[PDB]
Write the structure tokens for this entry.
Amino acid sequence: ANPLYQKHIISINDLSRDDLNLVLATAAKLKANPQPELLKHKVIASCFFEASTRTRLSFETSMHRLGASVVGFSDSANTSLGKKGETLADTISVISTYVDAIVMRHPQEGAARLATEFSGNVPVLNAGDGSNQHPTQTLLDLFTIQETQGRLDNLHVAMVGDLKYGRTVHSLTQALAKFDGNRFYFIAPDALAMPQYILDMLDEKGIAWSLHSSIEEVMAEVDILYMTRVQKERLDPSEYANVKAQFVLRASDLHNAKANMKVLHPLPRVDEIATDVDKTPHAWYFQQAGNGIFARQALLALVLNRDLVL
Amino acid sequence: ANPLYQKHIISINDLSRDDLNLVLATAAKLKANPQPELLKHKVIASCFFEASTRTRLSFETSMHRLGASVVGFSDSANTSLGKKGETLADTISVISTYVDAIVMRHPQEGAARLATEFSGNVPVLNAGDGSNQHPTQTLLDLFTIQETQGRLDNLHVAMVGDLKYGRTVHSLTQALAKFDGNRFYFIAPDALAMPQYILDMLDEKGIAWSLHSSIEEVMAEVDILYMTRVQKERLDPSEYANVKAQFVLRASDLHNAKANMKVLHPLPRVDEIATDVDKTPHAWYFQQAGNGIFARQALLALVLNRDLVL
Amino acid sequence: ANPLYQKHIISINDLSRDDLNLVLATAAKLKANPQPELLKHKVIASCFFEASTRTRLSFETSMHRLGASVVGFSDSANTSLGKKGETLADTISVISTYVDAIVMRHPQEGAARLATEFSGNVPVLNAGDGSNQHPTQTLLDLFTIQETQGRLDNLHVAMVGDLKYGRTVHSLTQALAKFDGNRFYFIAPDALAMPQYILDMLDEKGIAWSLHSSIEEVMAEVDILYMTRVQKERLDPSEYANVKAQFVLRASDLHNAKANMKVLHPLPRVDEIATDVDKTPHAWYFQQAGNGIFARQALLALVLNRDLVL
Amino acid sequence: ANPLYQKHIISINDLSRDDLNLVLATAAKLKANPQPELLKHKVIASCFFEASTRTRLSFETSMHRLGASVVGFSDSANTSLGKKGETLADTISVISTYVDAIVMRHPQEGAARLATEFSGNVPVLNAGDGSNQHPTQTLLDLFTIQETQGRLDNLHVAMVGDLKYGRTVHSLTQALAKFDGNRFYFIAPDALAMPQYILDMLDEKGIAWSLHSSIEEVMAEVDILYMTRVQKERLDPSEYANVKAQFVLRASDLHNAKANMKVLHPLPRVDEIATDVDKTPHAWYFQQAGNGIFARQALLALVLNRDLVL
Amino acid sequence: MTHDNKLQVEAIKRGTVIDHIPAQIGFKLLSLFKLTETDQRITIGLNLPSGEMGRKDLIKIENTFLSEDQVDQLALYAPQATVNRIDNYEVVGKSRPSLPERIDNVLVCPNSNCISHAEPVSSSFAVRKRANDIALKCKYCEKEFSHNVVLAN
Amino acid sequence: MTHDNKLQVEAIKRGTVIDHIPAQIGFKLLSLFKLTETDQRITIGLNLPSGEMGRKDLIKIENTFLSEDQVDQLALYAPQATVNRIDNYEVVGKSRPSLPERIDNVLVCPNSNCISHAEPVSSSFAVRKRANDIALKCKYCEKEFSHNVVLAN
Ligand SMILES: Nc1ccn([C@@H]2O[C@H](COP(=O)(O)OP(=O)(O)OP(=O)(O)O)[C@@H](O)[C@H]2O)c(=O)n1
Ligand SMILES: Nc1ccn([C@@H]2O[C@H](COP(=O)(O)OP(=O)(O)OP(=O)(O)O)[C@@H](O)[C@H]2O)c(=O)n1
Ligand SMILES: [Zn+2]
Ligand SMILES: [Zn+2]
């Protein structure tokens, strides 16, 4: 039976290097020969207690591409749950009484791991829990670095944007720190800097990093430039505007990019990457989102299948 | 490969007579022998940025009757998209990264044709764009005129109701003007008259039409009586009431109808067609809605299939 | 007592030429020599069941410049009275035991006239009742026309915009038609034209009216230009934007107007009057809104005080 | 006339040391020997386009203790003016024909300064405009500092909390920097620290400031401790809860404070000041909120009355 | 030389000379058609004397030949403009603008509900001379308007 | 009338010549300071060869004399320009721009929450600290930004 069989994918900190490679090699195989009936007769719950369309449509398409049925809800705007004080332990004790895996997003951190204490043997896969984890976004980003760069080690990865509160850059720095010789360049407004617990883990593992203030200082050496959105309310209107709105990428800036460099953005991008970047070979944000299908498919294939045929 | 293969069905003005016949003969075949696995393994997105239940349940049942999977959202009341300024070019560049056709309704006119510039090769089929087009409503109406009348040319078609803002009567007059010898009778309150660009196209094609003030002036000669709803806010409460609420059909009025005459209404009907009309042989509004399934099925079969088996 | 003492002020239809001149006479008196303790110890109720803050502040400032007390409310999506179940008739029956006069604006027509049968000896003054009446707007419009032109007879008044649904333009035409020799020009989009009843009344009185298509064709002969706001809901966006080279006024258009020509507008003036008009001498909408204070002081003074010797 | 007679009160930046002392001088006079008929017959407008009931009740009570009339509104999700389409400039242009003074609080910065160009000879007094200014809060803070300490020069003032976004702490530092020899201690979380512009201004004036990490290290030397509320949205829950052993004040912390040390807070004080402080002699936030009455009486009295002999 | 006209001004070796621009269209066209985004010498004349045609404007742009499509665009604006190319010190071709079939980019849809307004889209209108006017049909809306309504804006 | 030519065109009688405009600022200045809404003959030369910048722009507006504060409004765009005022073919005056104290109308407050965006008021900024690099403070929201930032959006 494969290692991931019937596991809960709750946190990146819980997956080993080995675990991460396995998911990535299965994604590569399913992207190459489809397996449209692998999860035939499985029913999977898509519980989005917090609405997230991008993530939901992606997760359910990939459940659909392996042959599974989907039942579920998207809420934030009412869909009767927690109705009349019903706890989340209780909702999950009732949903696991009839679906074969629960995919869930929830506003509070810790909610997917609590689901785990009540779901019996139905695997729980986390699609986001407040400001804590989002594994399936890190799996798709990793898959995309690997497929475009050929490797996951010895990379020069720049992380540009709001690094203090960008929940995805924090997990991608932890995943990449599992591999060797990567070098990190953080480029953030002072108010939005990469927190200490990250930096402290990088130092302790002997991994190199450095802060720069503009992308021009580092463009030439860079393989993956991962942009994040600054949310305008983490700053006031005039802080955003005043001199910090210059963590914006444009085509002109890409001149000296290595031929292999790729630009990644978990999306919505709104300001930070100008529309003229789209026409360049380095724009890989949309192809990154399409890889969400294979990464996500691979996790559901590995978790529901004892043995995998390939 | 069939002409419609992998086309975007955005506007009626873009479909030829030939194109319209083809869709209608395929609807007739699928209504006669079902093809429940024709779109097996296709996943289709049902994006209703504006909610429309009638249209959505119809479109998804017909995707289900050809074997396809559906992922999608209905919004107007929040489902997290346009979240944080995300443009529609960007949402479509991400949805076409994983579904095989996009069906979409949107509040603004032009939105399905914009989707087309960003969807790559995934066909976009328009389920309504503001006050502009709704092809799939005109295809189902046409199918219903054809199946009940035996032809689409040489008809006497009366259009009764709010003709100024009824987006469906405007497209059905353009589609029917593709065919020969049809005669139009418009019966509208003065405030709700058939706009000039319509009349001007009919004149220029040498097609006959005329305005009448009551259905009794024309009942005897009529084959298709297409009723539209007046929306009470296009008029004030007392304008509606005062003498213009007499574009209402009742059983009594049908006395002298030809035996073949049919009453069509895209629905909700609320006032305009009295409940006693339902028991008559001429009431075809509900059977018109059921034909939405075959018209809609035919378009998805023609657009996703290179060659069709029949 | 004065003729209006203790009278109800509900429709412009109900005030004779003479009552209209009495009000206007008084209001010039109060403007000139103010009497701030005239309604000392009176308590007026400002029942706005429909919010209109401009009208509410004008009235409450009128109440306080005559030294009266004010209790009341407004109700955009809020506060209890009329409830749903609790009738307007019972609301009024209870409030007319507490106050000395009731100013009310309600969304349904005739609400003020219903009120009159429940307020006892307490006078009720209409501030707007659905699309029916708003007499205190007509009273300030005539006061501004009389104060700029010197008379209310023999005027060339142009009325422009939504003549079909501006309640103010319907009223101002009835009131100006009690005075003699007035000539009316109605420049409106033919979908939004003056109702046949205003016109049929005007021809029974022998009054002269003509309809025009753009202000530029009467600019030369006109005394009062009464712009109205075109209500874009009663229109299609494309319809709204289609009309000629519009019916909005700009200073360039004014280069032919007589020196005593004044542009009036009940406000808001989103679009139809450009800012450059504000600096010409013909602009008088803001001054018109200040005369709202003296017109409503006048009405309250005559209704609540037995005879007036100012 | 007095120097502030008919002046607009918009930014603390615009009032000289002398104007600040005049206001404070007057307010002690009105507190001592009240003059309840000073603005008899004046009508002030309380335009709160943004609700703040504490500030609104303080001002309207100031208006009524001087015998003035009040018309106006508040607008948490409600009442018509400013509309969307109707400009602030046209709202003010119309209201300044009705009243004698306008107090206004608006959510966008500079709204009060825009107003000033449209109110004619009518004075406008700012009650808050986005994150820019709130001069009547600074005026009562200085009145409380002058009334407890005896002077406004040579003070050791500690400012604590969200120094980056408290508009009140930015203002109070400008105003105290017009008086001489003041020494400032700023105890803030380094993510929420005093902007470089307050500090660069303070060094151009030669003023002494130092930054500290917890109140306990300056408790001993301090005269005024000005607590601010830490705004938990501009923070992560875990960040919010992480800081030291906090920057909240409790009586235990006060056991070293000088006898004349007073704790001030603009209010609300959810968390940062514990209830046991309320009973110590150093607590002065409630008394500070009562001085709000005498500071705003003073401003209104000097702006609307030509010279004052109390 | 003199009855003024030339007094020393710009004869060019090769380029385009747009002449008889109607007065005030002259600056529209530079903006709209983004003619200054070049390094080549441009010499422009505004409110140029034209006893010959009232008053006019004239842009001279060298070593650049603005053709076919680019010329027909200008017709909505300066419909009586004669473009002239030059390749060695004299007129090698005079070209009047004819109305095109499509006008891309420079024009806004009057329709405020049209999706062209909020999106990364280049505007595009189909042109139709309906005697008395040119109607312009938007490619997104499919709403048709008088060219006077669209150019007014 | 004097022997013009296009590498440095010649003589207008009476009026203003703004010379030594950096490349590509000339059109910017025409559109921004609305110089073109006059009936006077303007002559403009773009990307010309000259006095050492190599390549420059130049604007000639006959009969208009724009001065002292008008010239100063040109300062963060063309600080090294010269505004010659001409009368009867003689350069009777040579000004250069200096930093103004107020720059009305032309700029846009980068602060998305100030009220100036939405209304019939024109922008106004107080200017601070010459050439080591300028600060502009909005009249309305009293927020101070770096000129580099106001000069993008
Ligand atoms: N070496 C040259 C040759 C011609 N031109 C310009 O090319 C234009 C072409 O006009 P032309 O055919 O030479 O005589 P016109 O009668 O002025 O043309 P039109 O019939 O339009 O008046 C003139 O404005 C002239 O300035 C030029 O700048 N340089
Ligand atoms: N009647 C005149 C006289 C001069 N000029 C213009 O005036 C400008 C410069 O004035 P001038 O002092 O005469 O030449 P320079 O000494 O080179 O001026 P500078 O050194 O400041 O460039 C030149 O571009 C010239 O075209 C003009 O157009 N019309
Ligand atoms: Zn359009
Ligand atoms: Zn600003």
